[PDB]
């Protein structure tokens, strides 16, 4: 997360904490339904119910 | 959820996902103004995709 | 000439009866075999045991007690104990099937098959007595068997004997400590049953006794035996005024005349002092002033209630030992001058004091030490409304969703039986606040 | 500070002083069953094998537990708690 | 679609001083230092009130079949169906389950033809509707499972008409309470505490809580003696009505 | 007094029952010859709950062994402690079910069920006052899952007010040994939910996971799984057979655990479970027992408890321990995990104490908890069943002897009905 | 609060036809619901109180406690629709001595007993709409043998339909009853 913060002109610690909260998308996935399409660019990840 | 409704879901419950991402952080360069809590948290992901 | 009969119903009643009868036997010097030793006489005078025991004519003595249960495990424990020859073998009435915490089962299904034998044995015990004083009943209120059988027994003895005094010592569930999941239901049903049938009720919540054991007795993992021993000590202190001489005697019949302002209000809480371990019992004076100060401490209440949240209505004092009336009067004056405790306006004096000469009896294998002076706290206050109010909300949460109601409906009890019990609770609560307001 | 036996096998409902006395005046908590030295040579003297095993495979593989369990002494709480007089006198203290 | 430029949206009062590497909790082990709050799983909510993703209906296919005698007539103010061949001649064993399957449909005119077709079918039928009852259990559970207010609201009205249309229908429906009652429990208390002001929605019976209560009311009187205990077993909240 | 009678069916049921009876025999000090060589007097006071006295002073279990093939009972008789059983209680056919629920419920089960009803009627009538029945069977097989359910229906019809308790082995999808598991599983659940008073579900995958992780033994065999199941099931009636601070028979547990009649499916667990080499180092105390008990991996099911809310839970403690500590630990765990406990059932934990520990332990705990997480197990079973049933595969075998697809359709719909009504109470609020 | 105020023949406390039928009344609800809807039996608007847990859901005549809703009228009467379920109501009464009494009428209760504060009484409801004339004269004269001077509160619990509460002061029949107090037969 070093170079990412350098390009974003933010602290290194906050970017890592920002990653950690987003990685807790399994709780959103564990609940029923709640389909996902995580693109953020070239690769698109589609998650149906499970 | 289109990777953006996730942002509201995380921002909706500060107690479940406490951290520095919940509030805005100052930038490392005085030229750039600090961003919104939602705005600063998207711009990290665009950097990660790149 | 004076006699009382103890009726123990349910597992909790039996387990506390064991401790209290052991205490009585040790206090009166009767060996577990029932035979007083030819030598080593510990008590002077005659017929002191006559209040609690009956003389067979030649030899042993038999307690004026009867044990009731629907499940035989604890009955067999008692029957194979060290007191097998103490009790009459046919007065330990044991059932066949357990009601399984079902008040309807204990009031409509299987308690009726036994209540006939219960009343037969009760009559065979009572007709022996001539100057009978009253009945003592012990029962855990959060159990189906205890609640239902106690309700039926009080109902039957209300019409069989009428005006005779009956004392009920319930053990209410703690505000947050509990063992079952349905105790509010049968607790409310039992309160409805016994509201109009008993004369005096005593609150004996287990959480307060746990707190007393932890703070004072210095016990970190107490069990039920210690609680039963303290309850037995309280009962013995209450009953010592009957079988022992004293400067100021107090009779059971002189309770409604001093502690019951209105027929509806007869629930009250107890406390006891001193409670100290032998490791530090001999390092302080144990003066009457400090023991009566400890008695009025809100943290020493035998039930989880705060007297500071309400006004005091009546309060009865029983001192046993070498206490002096002038010292008692000085202590009463000090308590009156204290501001933290406030009484109602329509009661100028609310203290009744009893003095006894016999010091409390110590038990080997117990926890308490030997002390000259002990005071029993018996008081009626408006603060007991909170225990009724909290269980009312405990009931409503489950009752709104018809939770666990089919188990009681299928045992012959109508669905609407809960509503009138709830109405009786609501009317009782409104009575407490109505009395508590000033004029 | 650390009354020795009171933690592992929890002591029952009783005064802390009495149970401390009971677990201090009891045997063990000392003595050399293996005659081991804390310096580290009787380690090479000793064997370190527990004689509480058997074998396994092709039928059942759980094995019975170590001797850290009671036996024969199984007896109810009412038997312990309620006895009449057969104890030490609480207030004897010979003079 | 529009989305604000994320690199521009900014905050003002937050101060731009940056601590940087000049940091550290080492050597300052005070008892007032902050601790982490670890992530905890949120409260599970499941899908009790989620949508059901309504399944496909056979009525739409059977209307495209061109083998159901029914026509939309626009001569009236409200469109009224006309029977090419009178319903008395039709075989209720074959057609009646199909029309019940159309209750799920929402697209015009499949939704329109379903309710109107059913009402005429039940109203004109006299005695042959009874043997069809076993075959009607499948559609009623499917539609009620959709968990949608409009479809549930209309078809509870259908259920009320079925019981009252003829005699002896309530008695035969008693064994089949177990397959339709559980939905009634969920929406039994689904009522609004309006308070004092007038509720103008009486004209359109769209209140689910009131509809369920009256539908269960009709079940008890017509079901018979055994009807009440079956309802109380299925739903615990219920209370007797015919009994005094 | 308050005796119960054991009935085991199928190969899996007999394998469970053999180990259970061996464990009970060692618990009560009964040698494989039937002679009492015990050391404590309490070992014989309540022997009549499970054992019958015969002339000559030997004890025989009142177990009825039922199967549709004589192969497995010849094996269970020849095994250790196989001489305890009365040879007249063995009942069998000569054909077998062939993992076909229809054949084990309509064609072959009906003609053989008369003898088993006769023998169980004799056994139940002989005893003074019956308390209940217990059944051990698997839902993945033909003869068991069918004939046992038919027998439970018959026994419930003849005895309306008695307690029926059963142990279920449910086929998980990850480890599956039969290609036709969903069919008979759904068909059996349909009747089981209607008939049984109490049901307990055991998953083989959970047993293997426990054996590999907690016990950390290299090669588990079916002996170890049976041992765990037997210990867990004996922990239920330990308090009925022995005294305790808070006695609580089977009837008391049901009243406190089933709020509504159709919700009687539970998951169980036993503590402590430790590896052989790590027993010198652990200190057995109540908080340790509770924290190992409430662990998700300790449960005997693939259902994960934090995916749903505990309706009610029950803990049975074996051995002597203080009452205050148990209550404080229960309150502590209830307050610490308030999210997983439903809020309209306050104080939803039940605790009982039995003073006699199991053979080889100073303390032991059995856990029974009713959680809404079992809805996942029902959902996954139906998905496979409908997947196979949409194309009508493996259907002619069941429909060749008098069944029709309407029965399968109503069985599937009833199972979904249970799922809906069971998840309804998860999200309900005050 | 209806003290030092004139009343001769009738005095209404609640009436379902108005902009706001209840000002003085206070509503407390836990699991129930309150609304005003028209009736199919009588083509007029009627108030609705329904819900489980009969005791918790109720409405009190005075908005707040710690004051008196004093009224001298001896005869009480209500208009209630029979829903064939549980329903009950209470009234607070003052006798010659300066002490208060409670009178209770319960649908599901089957026994009666007199107490110094509460005097419960079973009651029976016929089918359809009906009016109940609560005497309040002999009730205090029979239960406590004391005259009546003043009645304080009236309380209605859940699961009932209410059209009008008023005091008749005496036994009245339909012909002398004014039309607005009359319930016109459908
Ligand atoms: N103070 C005290 N209370 C006890 C004791 N044992 C049980 N209780 C209380 O009794 C309640 C339950 O009743 P049980 O002990 O099961 O006995 P029961 O009242 O006859 O009910 P049944 O089991 O149906 O026979 C528990 O909630 C405890 O609070 C005890 O030894 N001392
Ligand atoms: N716990 C346990 N499960 C077993 C054992 N043997 C078989 N099973 C399970 O039982 C299932 C097969 O059941 P089956 O033998 O056909 O039942 P039956 O037809 O009634 O005899 C398999 O999925 C196994 O997981 C055993 O010894 N122990
Ligand atoms: Mg009991």
């Amino acid at each position: 997360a070093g170079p990412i913060a350098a390009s974003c002109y933010l602290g290194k610690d906050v970017v890592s904490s920002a990653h950690n909260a987003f990685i807790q998308a399994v709780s959103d996935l564990t609940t029923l339904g709640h389909g996902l399409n995580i693109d953020f660019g070239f690769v698109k990840v589609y998650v149906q119910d499970r | 959820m289109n990777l953006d409704s996730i942002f509201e879901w995380i921002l909706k419950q500060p107690i479940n996902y406490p951290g520095k991402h919940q509030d805005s952080q100052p930038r490392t360069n005085p030229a750039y103004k600090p961003l919104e809590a939602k705005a600063q948290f998207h711009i990290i992901f665009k950097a990660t995709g790149e | 000439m004076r006699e009382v009969i103890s009726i123990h119903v349910g597992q909790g009643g039996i387990q506390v009866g064991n401790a209290c009868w052991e205490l009585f036997c040790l206090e009166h010097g009767i060996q577990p075999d029932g035979q007083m030793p030819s030598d080593r006489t510990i008590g002077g005078g005659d017929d002191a045991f006559n209040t609690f025991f009956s003389e067979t004519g030649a030899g042993k003595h038999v307690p004026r007690a009867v044990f009731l249960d629907l499940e035989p495990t604890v009955i067999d424990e008692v029957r194979t104990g060290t007191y097998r020859q103490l009790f009459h073998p046919e007065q330990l009435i044991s059932g066949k099937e357990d009601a399984a915490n079902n008040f309807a089962r204990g009031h409509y299904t299987i308690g009726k098959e036994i209540v006939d034998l219960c009343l037969d044995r009760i009559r065979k015990l009572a007709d022996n007595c001539t100057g009978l004083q009253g009945f003592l009943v012990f029962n855990s209120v959060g159990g189906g068997t205890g609640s239902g059988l106690g309700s039926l027994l009080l109902e039957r003895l209300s019409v069989d004997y009428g005006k005779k005094s009956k004392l009920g010592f319930t053990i209410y569930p703690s505000p947050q400590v509990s063992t079952a999941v349905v105790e509010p239901y049968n607790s409310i049903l039992s309160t409805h049953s016994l509201l109009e049938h008993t004369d005096v009720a005593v609150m004996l919540d287990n959480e307060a006794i746990y707190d007393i054991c932890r703070r004072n007795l210095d016990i970190e993992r107490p069990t039920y035996t210690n609680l039963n021993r303290l309850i037995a000590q309280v009962i013995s202190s209450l009953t010592a005024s009957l079988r022992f001489d004293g400067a100021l005697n107090v009779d059971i019949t002189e309770f409604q005349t001093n502690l019951v302002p209105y027929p509806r209000i007869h629930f009250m809480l107890s406390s006891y002092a001193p409670i100290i371990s032998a490791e530090k019992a001999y390092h302080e004076q144990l003066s009457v002033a400090e023991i009566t100060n400890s008695a009025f401490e809100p943290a020493n209440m035998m039930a989880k209630c705060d007297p500071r949240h309400g006004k005091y209505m009546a309060c009865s004092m029983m001192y046993r030992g070498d206490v002096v009336p002038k010292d008692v009067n000085a202590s009463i004056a000090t308590i009156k001058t204290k501001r933290t405790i406030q009484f109602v306006d329509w009661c100028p004096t609310g203290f009744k004091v009893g003095i006894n000469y016999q010091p409390p009896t110590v038990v080997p294998g117990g926890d308490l030490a030997k002390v000259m002076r002990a005071v029993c706290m018996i008081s009626n206050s408006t603060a007991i409304a909170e225990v009724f109010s909290r269980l009312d909300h405990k009931f409503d949460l489950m009752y709104a969703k018809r939770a666990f109601v089919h188990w009681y409906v299928g045992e012959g009890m109508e669905e609407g039986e809960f509503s009138e019990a709830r109405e009786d609770l609501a009317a009782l609560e409104k009575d407490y606040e109505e009395v508590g307001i000033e004029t | 500070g650390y009354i020795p036996g009171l933690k592992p096998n929890n002591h029952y409902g009783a005064s802390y002083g009495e149970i401390a006395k009971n677990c201090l005046s009891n045997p063990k908590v000392a003595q050399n069953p293996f005659k081991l030295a804390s310096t580290g040579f009787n380690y090479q003297r000793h064997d370190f094998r527990d004689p509480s095993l058997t074998a396994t495979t092709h039928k059942f593989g759980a094995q019975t537990l170590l001797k850290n369990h009671p036996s024969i002494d199984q007896k109810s709480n009412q038997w312990q708690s309620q006895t009449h007089d057969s104890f030490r006198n609480p207030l004897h203290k010979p003079n | 679609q529009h989305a604000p430029v994320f690199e521009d949206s900014q905050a003002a009062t937050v101060v731009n001083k940056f601590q940087g590497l000049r940091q550290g909790t080492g050597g300052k082990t005070s008892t007032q230092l902050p601790v982490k709050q670890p992530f905890q799983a949120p409260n599970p909510i499941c899908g009790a009130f989620k949508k059901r993703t309504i399944p496909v209906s056979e009525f739409r296919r059977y209307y495209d079949r061109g083998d159901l005698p029914i026509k939309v007539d626009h001569q009236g103010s409200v469109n009224k169906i006309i029977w090419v061949i009178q319903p008395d001649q039709l075989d209720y064993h074959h057609y009646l389950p199909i029309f019940f399957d159309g209750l799920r449909e929402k697209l015009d005119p499949y939704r329109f033809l379903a309710i109107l077709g059913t009402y005429d079918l039940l109203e004109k039928g006299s005695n042959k509707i009874l043997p069809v009852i076993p075959q009607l259990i499948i559609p009623v559970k499917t539609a009620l499972n959709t968990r949608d207010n409009e479809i549930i609201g209309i078809m509870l009205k259908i259920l009320q008409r079925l019981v009252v249309s003829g005699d002896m229908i309530g008695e035969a429906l008693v064994p089949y309470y177990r397959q339709i009652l559980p939905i009634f429990n969920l929406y039994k208390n689904c009522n609004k505490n309006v308070g004092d002001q007038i509720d103008y929605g009486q004209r359109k019976k769209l209140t689910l809580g009131d509809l369920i209560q009256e539908t269960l009311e009709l079940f008890e009187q017509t079901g018979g003696e055994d009807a009440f205990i079956n309802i109380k077993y299925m739903i615990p909240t219920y209370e007797s009505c015919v009994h005094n | 007094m308050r005796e119960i009678v054991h009935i085991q069916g199928g190969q899996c049921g007999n394998q469970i029952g053999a180990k259970f009876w061996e464990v009970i025999s060692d618990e009560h000090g009964i040698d494989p010859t039937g002679t009492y060589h015990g050391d404590s007097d309490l070992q014989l006071e309540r022997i009549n709950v499970y054992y019958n006295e015969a002339t000559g002073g030997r004890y025989v279990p009142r177990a009825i062994l039922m199967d549709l093939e004589p192969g497995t009972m010849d094996s269970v008789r020849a095994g250790p402690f196989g001489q305890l059983f009365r040879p007249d209680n063995f009942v069998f056919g000569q054909t077998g079910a062939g993992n076909n629920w229809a054949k084990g419920h309509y064609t072959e089960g009906a003609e053989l069920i008369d003898s088993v009803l006769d023998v169980v009627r004799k056994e139940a009538e002989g005893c003074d006052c019956l308390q209940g029945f217990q059944i051990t069977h698997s839902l993945g097989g033909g003869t068991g899952s069918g004939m046992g359910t038919l027998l439970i229906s018959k026994v419930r019809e003849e005895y309306p007010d008695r307690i029926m308790e059963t142990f279920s082995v449910v086929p998980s999808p990850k480890v599956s040994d039969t290609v036709v598991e969903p069919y008979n599983a759904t068909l059996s659940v349909h009747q089981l939910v209607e008939n049984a008073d109490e049901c307990m579900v055991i998953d083989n995958e959970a047993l293997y996971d426990i054996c590999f992780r907690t016990l950390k033994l290299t090669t588990p065999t079916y002996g170890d799984l049976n041992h765990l199941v037997s210990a867990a099931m004996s922990g239920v009636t330990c308090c009925l057979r022995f005294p305790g601070q808070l006695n609580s028979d089977l009837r008391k547990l049901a009243v406190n655990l089933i709020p509504f009649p159709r919700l009687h499916f539970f998951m169980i667990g036993f503590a402590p479970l430790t590896s052989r080499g790590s027993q010198q180092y652990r200190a057995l105390t109540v908080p340790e027992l509770t924290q190992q008990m409430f662990d998700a991996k300790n449960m005997m099911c693939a259902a994960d408890p934090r995916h749903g809310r505990y309706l009610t839970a029950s803990a049975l403690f074996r051995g002597r321990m203080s009452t205050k500590e148990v209550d404080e630990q229960m309150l502590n765990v209830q307050n610490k995990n308030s999210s997983y406990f439903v809020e309209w059932i306050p104080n939803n934990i039940k605790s009982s104490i039995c003073d006699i520990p199991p053979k080889g332990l100073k303390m032991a705990v059995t856990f029974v908890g009713n959680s809404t997480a079992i809805q996942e197990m029902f959902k996954r079973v139906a998905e496979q069943f409908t997947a196979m049933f949409r194309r009508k595969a493996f259907l002619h075998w069941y429909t060749g002897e008098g069944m029709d697809e309407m029965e399968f359709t109503e069985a599937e719909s009833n199972m979904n009905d249970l799922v809906s009504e069971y998840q309804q109470y998860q999200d309900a609020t005050a | 609060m209806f003290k030092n105020t004139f009343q001769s023949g009738f005095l209404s406390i609640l009436y379902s036809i108005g902009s706001k039928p209840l000002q003085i009344w206070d509503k407390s609800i836990r699991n129930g619901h309150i609304k005003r809807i028209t009736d199919q039996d009588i083509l007029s608007s009627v108030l609705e109180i329904m819900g489980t847990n009969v005791s918790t859901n109720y409405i009190t005549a005075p908005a707040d406690p710690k004051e008196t809703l004093g009224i001298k009228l001896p005869f009480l009467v209500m208009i209630i629709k029979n829903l064939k379920k549980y329903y009950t109501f209470e009234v607070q009464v003052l006798d010659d001595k300066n002490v208060r009494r409670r009178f209770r009428a319960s649908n599901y209760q089957s026994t009666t007993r007199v107490k110094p504060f509460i005097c419960t009484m079973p009651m029976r409801l016929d089918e359809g709409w009906n009016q109940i004339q609560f005497n309040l004269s002999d009730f205090t004269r029979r239960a406590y043998a004391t005259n009546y001077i003043e009645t304080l509160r009236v309380q209605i619990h859940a699961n009932c339909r209410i059209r009008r509460i008023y005091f008749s002061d005496r036994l009245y029949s339909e012909e002398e009853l004014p039309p607005e107090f009359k319930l016109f037969l459908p």
Side-chain angles (χ1 to χ4, degrees), chain F residues 12 38 55 73-74 77 104 175 208 215 218 223 258 270 279 355 382 387 391 400:
Chain F
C12 169
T55 300
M73 284 166 312
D74 273 8
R77 204 178 43 211
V175 293
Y208 275 99
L215 305 174
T218 47
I258 297 89
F270 175 71
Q279 278 151 330
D355 308 321
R391 283 312 284 285

Side-chain angles (χ1 to χ4, degrees), chain C residues 102-153:
Chain C
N102 184 287
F103 176 87
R105 279 198 89 198
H107 201 298
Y108 287 101
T109 298
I110 66 186
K112 288 178 168 61
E113 310 193 325
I114 304 307
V115 69
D116 291 331
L117 172 55
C118 314
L119 277 296
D120 216 351
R121 170 63 36 195
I122 287 283
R123 182 195 41 114
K124 303 285 255 187
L125 269 165
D127 59 357
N128 189 359
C129 308
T130 61
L132 188 154
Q133 289 301 119
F135 299 84
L136 315 185
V137 56
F138 299 73
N139 51 324
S140 80
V141 69
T145 64
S147 57
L149 268 186
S151 301
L152 199 53
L153 276 185

Side-chain angles (χ1 to χ4, degrees), chain E residues 191-199 202 207 213 237-244, chain G residues 19-22 29 32-39 45 47 50 52 84-86:
Chain E
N191 199 349
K192 50 173 55 47
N193 176 29
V194 176
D196 196 5
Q197 67 266 18
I198 294 293
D199 198 348
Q202 173 145 51
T207 177
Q213 196 265 335
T237 302
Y238 187 63
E239 162 46 10
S240 298
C241 76
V242 62
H243 298 293
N244 304 115
Chain G
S19 60
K20 280 73 176 175
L22 72 165
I29 293 298
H33 66 88
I34 301 173
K35 62 195 47 192
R36 186 174 64 184
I37 205 59
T38 73
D39 187 3
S45 167
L47 280 172
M50 291 265 268
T52 56
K84 296 290 185 68
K85 318 167 71 90
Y86 306 135

Side-chain angles (χ1 to χ4, degrees), chain F residues 1 3 44-53 62:
Chain F
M1 271 315 327
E3 55 276 354
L44 268 193
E45 309 212 330
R46 302 316 176 149
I47 203 68
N48 263 281
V49 172
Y50 272 125
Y51 275 108
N52 267 328
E53 187 65 71
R62 45 167 53 109

Side-chain angles (χ1 to χ4, degrees), chain F residues 54-245:
Chain F
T55 300
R58 79 179 301 163
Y59 311 90
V60 292
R62 45 167 53 109
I64 295 92
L65 282 72
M66 61 165 277
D67 185 301
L68 211 51
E69 169 87 332
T72 187
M73 284 166 312
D74 273 8
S75 69
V76 74
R77 204 178 43 211
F81 291 79
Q83 317 283 322
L84 272 75
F85 291 161
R86 286 200 37 188
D88 291 331
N89 282 8
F90 292 92
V91 294
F92 36 84
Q94 302 95 290
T95 69
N99 296 341
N100 191 246
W101 184 91
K103 173 143 75 85
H105 192 280
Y106 279 163
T107 69
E108 292 180 1
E111 65 183 1
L112 196 143
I113 210 70
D114 63 358
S115 296
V116 299
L117 272 294
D118 189 358
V119 65
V120 71
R121 218 185 327 262
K122 205 62 202 93
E123 272 284 4
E125 188 262 311
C127 59
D128 176 22
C129 166
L130 207 43
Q131 174 80 300
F133 300 65
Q134 62 165 84
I135 313 297
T136 62
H137 62 89
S138 172
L139 279 72
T143 187
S145 68
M147 185 180 288
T149 56
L150 188 153
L151 187 153
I152 297 169
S153 184
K154 269 292 307 170
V155 171
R156 180 43 67 95
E157 291 305 357
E158 308 201 6
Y159 292 76
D161 45 354
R162 294 276 83 83
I163 297 89
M164 180 88 46
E165 181 215 340
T166 175
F167 290 74
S168 311
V169 173
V170 185
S172 61
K174 313 293 270 213
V175 293
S176 67
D177 297 346
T178 313
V179 70
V180 75
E181 278 174 349
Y183 270 96
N184 46 23
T186 304
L187 293 165
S188 296
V189 160
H190 186 273
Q191 199 90 29
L192 184 54
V193 65
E194 177 198 18
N195 288 120
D197 202 338
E198 278 178 340
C199 183
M200 293 180 183
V201 286
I202 307 313
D203 303 68
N204 298 128
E205 187 209 66
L207 299 191
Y208 275 99
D209 195 301
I210 291 172
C211 288
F212 174 71
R213 184 140 71 230
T214 58
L215 305 174
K216 261 156 47 190
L217 59 86
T218 47
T219 56
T221 184
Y222 276 124
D224 291 80
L225 282 70
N226 288 270
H227 186 305
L228 301 177
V229 166
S230 64
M233 76 152 76
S234 69
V236 192
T237 185
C238 65
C239 49
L240 171 82
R241 283 179 286 117
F242 285 113
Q245 292 281 30

